[PDB]
Design a protein around this nucleic acid. Sequence first.
DNA 1: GGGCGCCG
DNA 2: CGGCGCC
Length: 324
Amino acid sequence: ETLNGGITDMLVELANFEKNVSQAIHKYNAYRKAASVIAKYPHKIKSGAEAKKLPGVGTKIAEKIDEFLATGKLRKLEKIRQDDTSSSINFLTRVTGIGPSAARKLVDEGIKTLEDLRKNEDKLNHHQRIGLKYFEDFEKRIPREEMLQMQDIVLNEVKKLDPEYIATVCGSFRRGAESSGDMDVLLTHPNFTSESSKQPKLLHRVVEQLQKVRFITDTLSKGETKFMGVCQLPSENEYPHRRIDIRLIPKDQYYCGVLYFTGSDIFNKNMRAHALEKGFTINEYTIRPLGVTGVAGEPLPVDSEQDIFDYIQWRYREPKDRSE
DNA sequence: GGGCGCCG
DNA sequence: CGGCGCC
Ligand SMILES: Nc1ccn([C@H]2CC[C@@H](COP(=O)(O)OP(=O)(O)OP(=O)(O)O)O2)c(=O)n1
Ligand SMILES: [Mg+2]
C-alpha cells in the first residue's frame, strides 16, 4: 500500500543528514516539506517529473527522485551508509541532550561510539552525562499500563499536598497511543495566572515531594514553569527510568495548555500556522488577534479547545485524531 | 510555530 | 547575552 512511500522515506533521510550532517536547515526544511506533499498526493508517482509538477518539490529534489525511481538508491544517499564521520554523528544524536553541535565536536575529538562516550565522559555536560548514563532505557517506550500507573502515582501526592492541583498527562496519552515516549504532564492550581505571577514553587513542590517519595530520580531542569526529568517505577527486585516532564500554567490559560501539550508537533504548527494566516498567533498561553500592523492582541476568551479551532475557523479535532 | 531553561 | 537542545 501507501504508494509514494519509498520515495518519501528516501526523502526524509536526506533531510536529516542535511539537518544533521550539515546545518543545511533550509535544505532539510524543504526536504521534509517535500516529503510531506508527496505523501498527501494520490497517484503512482512514476515520472519523477510528474512530481516536479507538484509544488514545493523542486528540480534537485526532483532529480533524487528518478535516481531512486530507476534503481533503489542514491549514492549520495549511500554515502551515509558509507562515510564514517556522518554515520557517526547520527548516533550521538540518538543521545538525549546531545544535539548536533556538541555532537560534531564530539566526533571532532574522535569520540565516536557509545563506548567512546563513556571513556572520557569528562567532556560532557551533566544533561548529557545523564543521557549516557541512561541511554539504553530511553530506547524502550513506555507501555500504556505503566503510564496509567505512573499517572496515578502522580495524582496522589499531587493532590495530597494541595487538593487544588490539576494534573493531566498529555501528549501521546491524550492521543490514545498504545505506547508513549514519556510522561508529558500538565499542571495547574486556582490562584496562579497572568495576574498572580510568581508561585513557581508549586511546581517545585510536587517534584519536591516526588523526589522525596522516590519517584523522580533525576533532574534535567528545574525552571520556574517547567521540569524535565527522570523517574521510574518502584520495584520488587526492575523497570526503566522514564523521561518525564511537567509543566505548570496560569490556570486562566489552561486551554492552550492542553492544546500544546497535546497537539502532535506538526498539529500545533499547522494550527499555529493557519492562525497567523487567519489574524492570530497562538501560544501555549493564549491566542490573540494579529492587529494587522503586527501587534498580538489582548487575549482571547477560551472556555474550551473548541473556542480555539473555532476562532481559527477550524473544525475541532478530538485528540486521538490529532496526529497530523 | 512558539517559548523555557542550560551554559559557556 | 546569544546559541543550544528540548518541549
Ligand atoms: N516543538 C514542540 C514540541 C512538543 N510540542 C508539544 C506537543 C506535545 C508535547 C511533546 O510531547 P512528546 O512527548 O515529544 O510527544 P509525544 O507525542 O508525547 O511523544 P512521546 O511518545 O515521546 O510522549 O509538546 C509542541 O507543540 N512543539
Ligand atoms: Mg539528541
